[PDB]
Amino acid sequence: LNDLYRRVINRNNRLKRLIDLGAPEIIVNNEKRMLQESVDALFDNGRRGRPVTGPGNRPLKSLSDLLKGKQGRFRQNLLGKRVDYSGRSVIVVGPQLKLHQCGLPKLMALELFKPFVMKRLVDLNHAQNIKSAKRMVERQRPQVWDVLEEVIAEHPVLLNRAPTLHRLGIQAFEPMLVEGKAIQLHPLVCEAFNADFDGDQMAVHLPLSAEAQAEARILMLSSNNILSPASGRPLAMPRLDMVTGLYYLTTEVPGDTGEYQPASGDHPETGVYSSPAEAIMAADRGVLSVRAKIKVRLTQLRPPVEIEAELFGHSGWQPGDAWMAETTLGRVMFNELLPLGYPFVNKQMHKKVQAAIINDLAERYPMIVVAQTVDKLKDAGFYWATRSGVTVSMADVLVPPRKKEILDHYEERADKVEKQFQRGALNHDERNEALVEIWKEATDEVGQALREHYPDDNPIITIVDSGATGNFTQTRTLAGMKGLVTNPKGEFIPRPVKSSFREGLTVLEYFINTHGARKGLADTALRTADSGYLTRRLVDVSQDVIVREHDCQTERGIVVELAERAPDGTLIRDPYIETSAYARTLGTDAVDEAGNVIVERGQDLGDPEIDALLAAGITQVKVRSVLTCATSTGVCATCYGRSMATGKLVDIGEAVGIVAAQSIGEPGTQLTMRDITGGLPRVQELF
Amino acid sequence: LDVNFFDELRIGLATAEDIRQWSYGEVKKPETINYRTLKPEKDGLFCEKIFGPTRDWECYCGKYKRVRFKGIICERCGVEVTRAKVRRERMGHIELAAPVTHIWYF
Amino acid sequence: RVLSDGDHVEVGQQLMEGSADPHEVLRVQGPREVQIHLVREVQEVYRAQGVSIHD
Amino acid sequence: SNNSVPGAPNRVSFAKLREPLEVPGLLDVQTDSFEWLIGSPRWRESAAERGDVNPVGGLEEVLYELSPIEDFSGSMSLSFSDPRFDDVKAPVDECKDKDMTYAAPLFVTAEFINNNTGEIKSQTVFMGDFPMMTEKGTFIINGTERVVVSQLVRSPGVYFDETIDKSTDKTLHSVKVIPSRGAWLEFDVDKRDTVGVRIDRKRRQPVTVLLKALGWTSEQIVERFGFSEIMRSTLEKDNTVGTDEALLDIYRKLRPGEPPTKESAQTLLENLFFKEKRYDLARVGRYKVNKKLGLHVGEPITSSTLTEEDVVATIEYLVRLHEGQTTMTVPGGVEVPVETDDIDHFGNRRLRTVGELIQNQIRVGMSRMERVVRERMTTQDVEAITPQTLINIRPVVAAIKEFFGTSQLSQFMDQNNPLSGLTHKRRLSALGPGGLSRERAGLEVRDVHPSHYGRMCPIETPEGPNIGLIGSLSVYARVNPFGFIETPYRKVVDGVVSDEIVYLTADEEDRHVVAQANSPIDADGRFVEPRVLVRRKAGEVEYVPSSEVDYMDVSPRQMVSVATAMIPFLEHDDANRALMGANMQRQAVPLVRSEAPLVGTGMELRAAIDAGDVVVAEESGVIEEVSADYITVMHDNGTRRTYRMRKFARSNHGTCANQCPIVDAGDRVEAGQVIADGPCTDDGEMALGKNLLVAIMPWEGHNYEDAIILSNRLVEEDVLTSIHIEEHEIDARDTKLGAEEITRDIPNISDEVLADLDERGIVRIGAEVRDGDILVGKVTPKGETELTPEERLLRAIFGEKAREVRDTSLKVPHGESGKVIGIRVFSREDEDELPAGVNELVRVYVAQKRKISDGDKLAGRHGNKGVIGKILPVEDMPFLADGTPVDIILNTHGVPRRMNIGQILETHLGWCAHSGWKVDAAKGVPDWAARLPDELLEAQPNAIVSTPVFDGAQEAELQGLLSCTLPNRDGDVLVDADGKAMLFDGRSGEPFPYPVTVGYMYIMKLHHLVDDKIHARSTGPYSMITQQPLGGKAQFGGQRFGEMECWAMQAYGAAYTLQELLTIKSDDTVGRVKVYEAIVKGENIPEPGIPESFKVLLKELQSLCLNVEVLSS
Amino acid sequence: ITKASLATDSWLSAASFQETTRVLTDAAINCRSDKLNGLKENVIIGKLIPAGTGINRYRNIAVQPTEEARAAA
RNA sequence: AGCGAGA
Ligand SMILES: [Mg+2]
Ligand SMILES: [Zn+2]
Ligand SMILES: [Zn+2]
């Protein structure tokens, strides 16, 4: 930049000399034009004419280029800065940690805390003065480890994982020392970061001020953020391994050892047990399987609603009362992990059911209990997943025995279409579509055959159908037939692939296959770029939507349909009710058959309320929303509705705008597509 | 310096009067630093007489060199003896022989 | 019933297939209808891939 | 019989097919091109074998096109001839050591002629030190190893395209004549029925205007072009009569602002197109125009410049295409089918190899040199000039230097392991000078093209923001003399599949029909079946016309590169995971021991030998004497030769380059035999990893989400460990104040801290050191510094030397430690070739032996990567019924949905290999074993095998082998038929309720070690123009709290912590010391100030004549 | 959304957003004054955001023990 | 400034 200034000064001085000496109009005019061009280049080089070039034939960074673009001063140095007192390392799963904890290697902690540890070891007189203490730490003298354990204690730390797609990308944990160089993360928060242990690098930041430490300890604590700010579904829920372990634990297998049998005339039922403890002690022996139907006399787990209402009815104090439960021992061992007050569930623990349980638990019980229960659940899940006996082997991947007959049956139709085309019956496009349809049908048929061929206890069906991970399309591709493969333009190859990966794809089938995978990988990058830009836009527009008032008392509101009247006469719950009317404040009192009010104005409209409205037979309800909010600045608490994350009404300072925008942007990328747009471009167009 | 009294921020066109009011001098030579002794030139693009002393608390020639001479200007070289960091604060200005038009508005 | 020639239409029924520009619907039906339109469309595109975002 | 080389480990293979052709010389892509550039006798003979009409080297070509040259008047001329190379000025190892570039002098015989009188003055001119290629195929530049990767670029010529016009829904056609450094005319057709030139990207024309500019008449235009209606249309719409008028309009439009004249218009067009000065199509370009338009198919090629014949034929082709004709016949030219062209089709994507790149750079330097010469000729006194004083060589040497250094296609060699170095060669990058950049590159260049089959690997590709632009050559691919990529195919006539192999380019394959390799043959050279799989022109894998398929694929695995060709059971892996596995085969670190895989591929050997990290006997003989450092072998005729090993030399990426002999003192060794292996080689086979006993159980959540748990045995027995060498450099420069000095003369140095240091200020050799320890003791002259009275009083309290010379000594960077392998003292005092200014440059080599630990990244060969969650004691490990503890435990949940069960198959096969088997052929062979090759019904324990990529172990064969798994030591088969065994829990002790898949997997230690990733920062250097401390672990990384992190922070409503971060952690220059003081002394953290970046913004806006003021209120 | 953002009454935020040169030229010609009320602005100049723990009801809470606590002393 | 690479 300095050189540009030199150019300006040279030309100005030469102009001054030219006016002084007395020069022809032509020369002095040209010099004036040159001065104009120099000032132009200085303020903005390259805007008019070719940019002034420097050594190496590159434009000079003009005084304005400092300000614009990604690398301008605004979006590299002002709003985004590098910061001291920070670290970074690879992450390794640690299941032994509590939800509010994270491992932190000794060297990294020592360095990060070097000021504090210096202070403590000077206070402890292990060193005479500050500089002697600094020498003490720089050589890691043996005495400086105990003091380090003293200082780190009760000092929260934030763990970011770039990119921070949403609010839960950065959470505060209580750090704990670990031996070797690797931040030991808690598994249950993996989803919140979307951080999966194959070489992700998670940065660490250290709050200092009392306000910052309070903020990290209170607002940001990992155990304080369970429910998503977007849709409120639990994000610390067990998954992958834990969910499989629990599914194995709580499922029931008829005909197992130690089952219940009510046979009489020769012996008693021989299926009942005095207490759950007895059941575990029997399971230790090779007598009772953990997945057998039995009858246990429970005296410490609350019965479900109907049994409570029958045996006790009014005020059943379960901690002492006893009741006969006909379930599996595994389900009992599960139900001990839930709080005392939660009723007995007695259901197979699909991931869906786990999510429902955690949602209800968070709605009712205080958050700390939710954290403790989730952690116990993780422990049991890992243990029983280890015992679950889920492993993959070629022998466990069973191809369908009817595959060849279906292949012949559908290849016959394919040959028929080939013959019809060879006689000119139809053009290339028509026969391509005909083959596409025939082979898609074949696809569905072999998929059905494979599904019905598998038993239920197979490792692959067990993992997929428990909700743990993966979808049946992947299973069908694994055994059976992969299917139609995408043309690199995007169309469907009418070949198609007819081979299972277990059977092993042929050379040409593989070559055809590569098109789709390469295109998918390419499509990921541009789409995440556009998603990031969209999020930037939405954030800026909503950078000033924050709560200001509790209530504006505005009569205005919107109407939401809820259930639609059936033609036969019935209320079927509208499918998309969980994202429309939930977590909303009623604008007007509900009315039933011109009767009393089921739920009057100003109620959160949580699950019982919607159930009551559906039962009573009302569909349209007027709810308050941000749209019809009377308050000029920002919005009010009531009109906005319930905070999805906190589970209660919003505070008077929440920046709901940023939360909104980030929640819109977060499902980017995972928002895929299959001319009117229908993907992320369509969203962009709408906004 | 600066305080929390930032209640309002204003931007506007800067007239030549304002520009020469900001400036602590008027650079009139295209000389950065001496090739040999590696020091700023007089009236150059790094002139110590304008933007302050390179190393804090002494004038160019060195007549005054310590803190008690704070806010004093040495007669020999004219350097105001103060903190060096002010070099990030003080501006110059070039008095153009002929008027020029700012590109942004063109 | 499929919309066909000779049929009495509404003030908002999409005549043809495909989307409609939000300026037009605003000018026809005021702010509320365009609001409901925009929210419905964005929610649809998100729901089409199975991601749940509260309205 | 693999044969291949004399020394051969008997790795039996599961291959059914027999390769007709051995895998070519994988490094040929570079060495052959460079030999062509030189004009070496080897290249001369090779070209003679296949086109002896015109053997001319790249240099020779440049000189020929350059020579002769004349001035403006033509009174004298200068010419070049006879390029030649002297012996290299130094051997490879020395050139590597002392930084000097492994180069040889280049000589050209000049010849200066004076036309007025008649003389010829000739003498060699010494163009400069050309950089040469070592035998391994890499250049040595400034001591480092550099490789010129091949570039993929669109070939020149005539390309026709058609697009619909949504405005009218009509198919409009356009053509691009793409030259090498030319003009870019285009005959574009718009929706309006008028064909029009767009000459040099300038505002369109009617074609008839141009035609009349060449000298055509309206009747002639009707004669040649009248058949189409658009041509008549544009004729009438032209409203432009007269050749003078046409040339006037064109000249007015081409170079406006200059005075139109009827003399400098013909020259304009003729120079612009029909002169080689500005419009060289090159040889490939002119060949393609001739073939596509069929003008000079019979004639050899020369004079790349065009002819009006060319352009008029182009317009004719375009108009016929718009009409919808199938074929056109030019008068005097073969008929060619009228069709639109592609762009990505490898008949248009050509390879600029090393030879072409260096030749282009030479040509650029030669153009500059000729410009300098031509300029000075006006001022050259006649008869007082000779070539030697006439030729200035500096621009040429400068151009070659600035090429080999900082040119994009001259990349720093990547010797992570022999495979990584090998795969960096054969790497085709689509980006660079004259190529598509990542940003401007679309999404359609990145995808596979059906023409890629056999010429470029669809699998191997970077996963980052580069996928598609960079790929790898197929194994059998061979580069066309014109720069295209040829592939081998067996020709079959009358269904007789002979061994006659022919190399076909993309276009030639497109014309013909090619079968598939694994199409069974009846052993008579004929197809044992009807319905033989086939590919066709448009890239569609379609149903087949049985018989009369003109060609076939030399073998399976023809479409895969060297890296991905080493993945056993590749056909069972999805493209994504195979891509990753190929990528990760290039990140494995060389282990201390290295063990060949039990389960591999035939390529484990060829890759090792062609990687050129392995010593091969040049000629047969008997090993006379072998030692750890050298091997002296007595050849069969008197002479003896000594190969000196390379011991613990540092590679370009800090890895070890150790070589050790494998031949005893009595062995006789034939030529082409391996005599000393390398980093990742074991008895000649590439061994990147280790064979470990593996289980597939989810174990207590420690192997959660592709996290890996290891036996401590792997640490104790030291089966996973890497040597890492890092060099630290320090120079005694000269300053105005004085000069630095490298010696024990240091200020304020403790006795101990100076103990390690030798008298010369160099740490003692082979000494253990730690972060911060003085590697080399250096002190810089302090000049003059104003001291502090408090320091003066202190110095008096101690009554010691105040001292002046400032202390700046080479110290171990933070987080490093190890042994001092070597110290090199290159000094100006020793008269070393130090760069101007440094008086003594010392390099210290520090090596550390890194063992496996949490955070390190392992992975198999099927994209099954992961960091190590934990390393359990061997006792609490699942151990088989026999008491053998497993080594690793991967997670089951990762297998199905990642769709890479190849690993599982490998696992099974690995166990079968480790245990050894014996097929019970008591009553004939079992049906499933009928097709198994002989010598596979039996295999001793720990017998290595190979499954070729697309022709290997069929799952039925795996089942059968897994059934017969002869017992380990006593009578007990630990793994059942299914491949799963019963495993005892190490911790509880009870056996696991269900059997668990157990086997042997070949996994690797990837070069992403945690020690190089861990980093921390409390306070350190800060950037210059702004604060916000310096980023990067290299300096002292301050972790970027970017924008999305600010958003997340706001969303929590967490405001004070945000302000703290962005103000006093990052920028605020006054608060920062204050918070440090508060922390040290235990006071409340002060109030944040204004970040120092806002003020720089204020000053910059003010500097733009924008009066910005902060009003108080 | 873009237009709505660029129509805010804060030039320091619009400039931070996009198309810097034009927005600054416009704001300069209008002698526009930014009141520093949004979030991006408060971030840029490094004072406390007016959201969450930064608004004027929590930012200035007065905290003291109870008279019973003073009695405990 | 340029290269290559991880997530
Ligand atoms: Mg990852
Ligand atoms: Zn409201
Ligand atoms: Zn002075």
Author numbering:
A (entry chain D): 340 to 1013, 1023 to 1035
B (entry chain D): 2 to 107
C (entry chain D): 1097 to 1151
D (entry chain C): 28 to 1140
E (entry chain D): 1210 to 1282
Paper text:
Within RNAP, a conserved, two-stranded β-hairpin called the β‘-lid projects from the clamp and interacts with the β-flap at its distal end, creating a protein tunnel that encloses the σ-finger (an extended linker connecting σ3 and σ4). Nevertheless, σ release during promoter escape indicates that a gap must open between the lid and the β-flap for the σ-finger to escape. Cryo-EM density for the lid is absent in this class, suggesting significant conformational dynamics in this structural motif. By contrast, the density of surrounding structural elements remains clearly resolved. Although σ remains bound in this class, the loss of lid density coincides with RNA extension past 6 nucleotides, consistent with a conformation in which nascent RNA collides with the σ-finger and initiates lid displacement. This structure thus represents a state poised for σ release, which is captured in the following intermediate, where σ is no longer present (TEC-Backtracked). We hypothesize that these lid dynamics create a path for the σ-finger to slip out from the RNAP cleft, allowing σ release, but only transiently during a short window of opportunity as the RNA transcript extends. Along with biochemical data, our structures also show that the β‘ lid, a conserved motif, must rearrange to allow the displacement of the σ-finger.
RNA polymerase (RNAP) is the central enzyme in transcription. Promoter-specific initiation is directed by a dissociable promoter-specificity subunit, the σ factor, which must bind to core, forming the holoenzyme (holo). Here, we present seven distinct intermediates showing the structural details of M. tuberculosis RNA polymerase initial transcribing complexes and promoter escape, using a de novo cryo-electron microscopy approach.
